[model samples]
Target: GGPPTIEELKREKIIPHVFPDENVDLTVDMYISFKSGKEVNHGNILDLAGTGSVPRNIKFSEEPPEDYCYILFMIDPDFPSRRRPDGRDYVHWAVSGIKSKELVKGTDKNCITLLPYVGPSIKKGTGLHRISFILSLVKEENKGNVTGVPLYRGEHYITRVKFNNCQSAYNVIQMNDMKIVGFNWCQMRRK
Candidate 1:
């Protein structure tokens, strides 16, 4: 069919599974293209090699209002292994303060890199790891409020694990009046 719809995503357990407590509406279509030009589609499976680098581009189907900015997050809920996911919602990358105008023009300039992009690192036999891209919109007036929000820190592998996106991250969104307006994901596993 066309790009993955919100209904399909919900049915596949990609919506509430990632943001269980929040009601996310995929009002905009997020197009994520990696450096190799491979696009991420909901529930599609990708090989490890194709995801080594950060996404080459991210474009939304609908542009946010001039008074709003964007916060993009890439997370994997099934970390280490799907069955033994002690580390859920591992943040692979997170960026905020993306100007709507810049994003519409296909750029992420002036954005704050809360977490640099790291490709999927599924272990052998971990089954399919869900790599999700969640997008939120923040009004310009509240942009400064998100600057100090706490996110899982450290570059070490272990430190990146166990990020409470549903709580910790969502708290920032909710407390700052941000809206989760777009989401998409793909599955990946070790070869």
Candidate 2:
């Protein structure tokens, strides 16, 4: 068969509740290769013993628009653990202004690194964590304008959900009514 459907993904327990509710299009085939020579896949469990600061490759399924800017975000939504998850929500990495899939082009000049990438190191016995990589498009405002919207940029520690970190990412999606263009992510566990 072709790529799995959204319903199929949910049925197989590969996604979270927010994923289906948010209606994200995850069919895009994006493979992330780690510095350790490991290619990631859906629900791939990785050991955090000897990871690196940045990924080796982020090959996208399709070539995104060149004029359109995009944001790459890797966050740990489950945080310390699902049952004891506080609002802290550790943000592993955030890159902005990535045009035309520059993430995969091997040219990161246009990309702004808000937070440096760090391999996961979940507390012992905290359970597996959902390390999500989201690709958000820069919104188009008034008359379908993509240049007017001010995309959030900067580096800061986000601990609460309502703060700028959470609010900004959340607001951008809500503000744009984002469509399921595409997104990529995977899972990891540490002991």
Candidate 3:
């Protein structure tokens, strides 16, 4: 209904039971370069990257498209197995409806709530989870001013959704949350 506000999505807390240092504290340097090696201009476009949690930020320098939707995904990041009205740790947070020239981190949560790097909401699983957060930017078909696509009607719908299956998301030993969470909010998105 409106432009995304620049707010702190993450509450800035630490998970004693999950992340190292007993807290999810990591500020990374994030940027999105074009696949063509050219910088992103003003338009509805989709950006892709390797999976991992590192506190990312999707950014732009100029006045970006007015209407848009984006997704910062972790292609193969192992997530908790908790659907709705079930147990827990089941597909907790899935990125959807992102936009171009947008900020991928907690600074601007259009509709979704910002969650600290909890690695994985494995309220059940014990071992480590290897997941990544990929920050994607898609344009909305016809919003107001932004450049986004219509949900459930865009060509990059499924493509926008990462971790298509449970094969890619798995549990490992290292805390690749930064590298695993993929889409991190370090500072500025990309300029």
Candidate 4:
């Protein structure tokens, strides 16, 4: 009903599990639609192959503030498997420097792609993996100062694994003055 609310997300353990320290009091409506026109909603079950390409569309339900910008992160906390999550919070996709107008326009023209989008590659027998999309808001003044997680181009999967979203968000919030304003996720498994 109503596509699962933030309170329901907390009850489902997506809060403390994915963003433990960040206070998610505010919520922004984000729509991530795939090529097949399928959209990702909180707790929705998606197909592994269906979400193979980058999102066909990414838009907010409402326009963001003119004085602010946004950062979006796609992560898999149950990487490899939920039972043995040694590779927790796998960085699936990371983008920053999305201007307020840019977000409203649904374009990545001036946005920085920290980590290119990679579809879910859930391992076999992992049951269901939770893939989360976290959105952070930052002031336009701090747009250039939005230093994200330490990531390198053409890096190996080993480096991508065991990522700490909370820590990175904490650094940006405390240092760069950012806020975690939105959150959405879906459940998927190896096909």
lDDT of each: 0.70, 0.53, 0.30, 0.68
Ten-residue region with minimum lDDT total, candidate 1? 100-109
Error of 1 at 169 (Å): 4.5
Listed in order, each prediction's TM-score against the native is 0.82, 0.72, 0.28, 0.81
lDDT of 3 by residue, 1-191 (tens): 02111122223211211222322222322354322342222112222232124334545333223554443433222233312212212222334434435554433545332222222233343333323333333344422221121233333442322222222222211212212222332111111
Identify the superior model by lDDT, candidate 3 or candidate 4: 4
Please list the residue runs of candidate 4 whose C-alpha ends up more than 4 Å from where it truly belongs after superposition: 1-4, 100-107, 148-152, 156-158, 164-176
What is the Cα-based TM-score of model 4? 0.81
Can you rank all candidates by TM-score, best first?
1, 4, 2, 3
Best to worst by lDDT, what's the order?
Answer: 1, 4, 2, 3
Writing each residue's lDDT as its tens digit, candidate 1 over 50-89 gives 7777776777776677888888878778887888877776
Backbone clashes in each candidate structure, one number apiece? Answer: 0, 0, 68, 0
- Candidate 2 to truth, TM: 0.72
